[PDB]
Amino acid sequence: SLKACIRCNSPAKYDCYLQRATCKREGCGFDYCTKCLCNYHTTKDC
Ligand SMILES: [Zn+2]
Ligand SMILES: [Zn+2]
Incomplete structure (x- = not known):
């Protein structure tokens, strides 16, 4: 059920x-969104 990173496909929670x-x-x-595999919505931005 782990998410594969967009780099080396690692076990991401x-x-x-x-x-x-x-x-x-x-x-x-x-941290990153598993929907767009991009930056996650944070205090800064998405
Ligand atoms: Zn990785
Ligand atoms: Zn997003």
């Missing part, structure tokens, strides 16, 4: 709650 994924890699570890 997929959260259907907000349709977001968090790469579980020490080289990535970033």
